[PDB]
Design a protein around this ligand. Structure first.
Ligand SMILES: Cc1oc(C)c(S(=O)(=O)N[C@@H]2CCOc3ccc(F)cc32)c1C(=O)O
Length: 358
């Protein structure tokens, strides 16, 4: 790697790892379209296994970017439309509060207050139906944004129904395989367990637990190499040969709603570049990112703006991840760690690195 990339990365990440006590970390910088990789520390403390470019990390909510792109692919395939009512794909959803709630509302957290978490009590398909039938919106559709697994998770499950495929099968065949993400998984195979890092929470080794809509909302595990490739694909959709996936990537970066300085895409979130760093940094703190906020509709949605800071934070109980990229500069970063450390620290480090290279 160019010494300039080496210098800013090490000068930024070394202090970060010490201040946050991160056991292991992998970082990729995409610079003029080329990836450069960095690793530190331990994938497994107990067995002294180092983090490598093949270590799998839990992406948590960065998984929602794969869900949003897979949904965009279904749109491009003509299988679903964002302007279609939720009940078109779940007719058993007969409760009257669902009138007027479209797939767009589900994909973008604007259904009217769907909860952040699906309740642990919810498991079976009939358990989920009962949960959404009984749910009472606090707001009319399309008026407030409340970040929610039960929202985009449902979007993901419904968006693959016309394909007839399972959500995982659709993700593998329409997103992972065409993009050569050959070490990215909803379920980690036994052959790959040697590369699966442990997450660390209060010093205990943990992996994510199964839960309703986990695949759709926080279920992807991946390597720094595949995530670099994920970033490259989202920086330059036009180089992707499968037409509907290229189009679905563009749809996931369209701007559907605005709240404050931020624009909601499908999974991805976007701000105009150049950004005020305090705006994305403080904006990422859960105090703000998880709050109920009124939204302005963007009518009709703005297509992917190349002068944007496109990003997603993501966490599990034992992992913390961040992706950000600026399509206009062919510049991006992936930060994967096996500790859940605060979002603003992630974004601040990412901004220092990317601002130095832009
Ligand atoms: C900001 C946010 O809220 C929610 C519900 C998610 S999550 O569902 O996608 N991630 C997992 C689910 C299961 O264990 C944990 C434990 C702690 C934690 F911070 C995330 C997660 C995220 C995120 O990942 O950013």
């Amino acid at each position: 790697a160019p010494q300039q990339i080496n210098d800013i990365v090490h000068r930024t990440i070394t202090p970060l790892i010490e201040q946050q006590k991160i056991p292991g970390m992998a970082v990729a910088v995409i610079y003029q379209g080329k990836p450069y990789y960095f690793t530190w520390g331990y994938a497994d403390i107990a067995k002294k296994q180092p983090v490598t470019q093949q270590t799998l990390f839990e992406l948590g909510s960065v998984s929602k970017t794969f869900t949003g792109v897979l949904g965009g692919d279904a749109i491009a395939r003509g299988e679903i439309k964002l302007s279609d009512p939720t009940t078109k794909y779940w007719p058993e959803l007969t409760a009257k509060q669902w009138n007027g709630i479209t797939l767009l509302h589900l994909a973008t957290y604007t259904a009217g207050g769907l909860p952040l978490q699906v309740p642990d009590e919810v498991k079976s398909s009939s358990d989920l139906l009962r949960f959404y039938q009984n749910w009472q919106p606090a707001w009319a559709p399309g008026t407030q944004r409340l970040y929610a697994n039960s929202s985009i998770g449902l979007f993901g499950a419904l968006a693959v129904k016309p394909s007839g495929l399972s959500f995982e099968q659709a993700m593998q065949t329409r997103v992972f395989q065409p993009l050569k993400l050959n070490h990215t998984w909803i379920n980690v195979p036994p052959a790959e367990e040697k590369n699966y890092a442990w997450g660390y929470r209060e010093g205990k080794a943990v992996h994510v637990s199964p839960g309703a809509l986990d695949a759709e909302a926080y279920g992807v595990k991946s390597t720094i190499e595949d995530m670099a490739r994920w970033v490259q694909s989202n920086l330059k959709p036009l180089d992707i040969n499968e037409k509907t996936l290229q189009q679905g990537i563009q749809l996931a970066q369209s701007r559907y709603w605005q709240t404050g300085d931020m624009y909601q895409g499908l999974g991805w979130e976007m701000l105009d570049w150049p950004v005020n760093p305090d705006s994305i940094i403080n904006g990422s703190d859960n105090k703000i990112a998880l709050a109920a906020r009124p939204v302005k509709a963007i009518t009709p949605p703005t297509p992917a703006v190349r002068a944007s800071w496109v990003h997603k934070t993501g966490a599990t109980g034992g992992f913390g991840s961040y992706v950000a990229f600026i399509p206009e500069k062919e510049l991006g970063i992936v930060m994967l760690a096996n500790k859940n450390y605060p979002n603003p620290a992630r974004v601040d480090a990412a901004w220092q690195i990317l601002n130095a290279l832009q």
